[PDB]
Amino acid sequence: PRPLRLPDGPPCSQRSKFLLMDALKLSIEDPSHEGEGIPLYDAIKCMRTFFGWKEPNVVKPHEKGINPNYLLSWKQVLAELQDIENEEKIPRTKNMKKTSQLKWALGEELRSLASWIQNEFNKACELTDSSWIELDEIGEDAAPIEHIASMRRNYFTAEVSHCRATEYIMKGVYINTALLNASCAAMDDFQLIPMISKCRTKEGRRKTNLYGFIIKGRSHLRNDTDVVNFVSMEFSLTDPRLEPHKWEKYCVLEVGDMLLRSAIGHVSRPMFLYVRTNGTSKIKMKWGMEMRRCLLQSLQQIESMIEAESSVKEKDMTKEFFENKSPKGVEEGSIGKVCRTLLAKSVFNSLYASPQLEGFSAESRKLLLIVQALRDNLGGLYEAIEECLINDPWVLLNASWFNSFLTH
Numbered sequence: 346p347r348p349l350r351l352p353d354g355p356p357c358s359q360r361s362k363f364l365l366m367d368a369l370k371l372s373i374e375d376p377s378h379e380g381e382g383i384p385l386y387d388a389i390k391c392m393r394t395f396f397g398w399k400e401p402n403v404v405k406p407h408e409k410g411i412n413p414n415y416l417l418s419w420k421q422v423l424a425e426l427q428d429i430e431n432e433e434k435i436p437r438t439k440n441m442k443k444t445s446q447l448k449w450a451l452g453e454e455l456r457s458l459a460s461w462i463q464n465e466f467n468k469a470c471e472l473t474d475s476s477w478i479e480l481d482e483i484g485e486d487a488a489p490i491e492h493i494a495s496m497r498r499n500y501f502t503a504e505v506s507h508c509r510a511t512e513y514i515m516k517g518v519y520i521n522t523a524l525l526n527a528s529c530a531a532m533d534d535f536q537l538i539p540m541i542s543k544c545r546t547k548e549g550r551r552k553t554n555l556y557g558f559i560i561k562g563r564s565h566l567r568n569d570t571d572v573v574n575f576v577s578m579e580f581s582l583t584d585p586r587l588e589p590h591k592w593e594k595y596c597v598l599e600v601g602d603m604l605l606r607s608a609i610g611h612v613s614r615p616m617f618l619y620v621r622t623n624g625t626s627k628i629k630m631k632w633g634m635e636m637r638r639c640l641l642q643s644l645q646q647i648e649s650m651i652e653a654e655s656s657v658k659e660k661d662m663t664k665e666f667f668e669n670k671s672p673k674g675v676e677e678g679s680i681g682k683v684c685r686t687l688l689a690k691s692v693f694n695s696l697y698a699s700p701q702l703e704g705f706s707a708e709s710r711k712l713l714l715i716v717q718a719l720r721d722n723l724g725g726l727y728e729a730i731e732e733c734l735i736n737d738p739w740v741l742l743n744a745s746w747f748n749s750f751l752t753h
């Protein structure tokens with residue numbers, strides 16, 4: 346009966362492991378330098394495509410942190426990358442000096458819904474100008490797949506291969522793979538770990554992208570829940586003073602100026618560096634390495650809808666579904682947007698996983714069925730649900746969405 350009660354408070358703030366809509370890439374095309382494919386070599390080549398660096402300064406301090414240490418840490422990254430450029434053979438990995446600023450940074454309340462998380466979600470459903478996965482990316486079948494399964498997979502893949510949520514998947518798979526590997530290969534080192542992704546342009550050109558860096562702390566991970574701390578340093582064109590509540594956990598630096606094409610001609614815009622301390626565990630990195638399953642889970646939700654239509658119509662409805670041939674339209678606007686919306690929710694469930702999300706998802710689905718039953722044919726459950734509406738942006742956004750469902 347009642348709409349869910351969302352908490353009052355200061356706006357919720359960003360809590361993802363890496364930047365989403367605000368990320369910025371320095372990229373190299375068709376890379377062919379010596380040692381191409383080694384993360385550190387790619388990172389340096391990406392860094393050297395940019396000529397607008399300048400003396401960095403704090404433009405949005407971290408209110409609870411030691412801001413001079415975040416500044417020192419970024420200047421240390423740049424200095425140590427220069428040292429690598431001066432060694433004859435670029436090494437495969439780079440362990441940072443255990444400076445005072447890095448030792449500090451590596452560790453050696455009700456919130457209301459803010460509009461930024463819905464905007465993040467809209468951004469994640471969008472198409473980009475690049476493809477982020479191969480044609481046979483989805484699935485892990487041992488045997489060749491049937492004709493109908495293949496047809497459905499190829500339809501779906503064409504709709505999500507360029508999706509921004511798919512960039513987040515591959516970004517997430519790469520950085521969790523590299524951090525989990527470093528956590529056992531270099532347990533005592535403050536290893537510098539580039540944040541990289543790869544894509545293919547519309548013209549078919551292979552591109553390598555640098556988002557920033559993380560520096561990992563000491564990582565003797567004896568069990569799945571042991572934490573390795575890290576410091577993330579991420580490029581962005583987003584000025585943090587426009588939405589400061591989003592950036593509560595970050596110290597934000599201004600590190601350069603970038604020349605850009607736009608709807609005017611060339612414009613110069615400042616480049617920022619978003620810095621925060623963070624942590625993760627073996628179990629979370631293993632999930633991060635599995636983010637490609639978001640593609641399979643969302644494909645299966647689509648296949649479920651096709652199999653429903655195919656049972657009512659005693660025929661395979663794959664083509665009629667994906668070509669939008671009984672329904673006379675698509676509420677989201679197009680079949681492609683249905684696919685990408687399903688994918689973005691799966692991805693955000695992974696990016697923003699939490700016990701609040703798990704609690705809200707089960708208990709709200711119970712209230713859901715009850716309210717349809719009362720709708721079609723005509724307490725303390727509310728406490729279970731609203732116990733999960735504390736401060737998590739994604740859970741709060743889903744609660745807001747649920748209330749749109751109650752109104753309609």
Ligand SMILES: Clc1ccc(-n2ccnc2)cc1
Binds near residue numbers: 398427
């Ligand atoms: Cl690879 C690389 C590029 C630029 C810099 N840098 C030095 C000062 N400002 C940027 C350091 C390393």
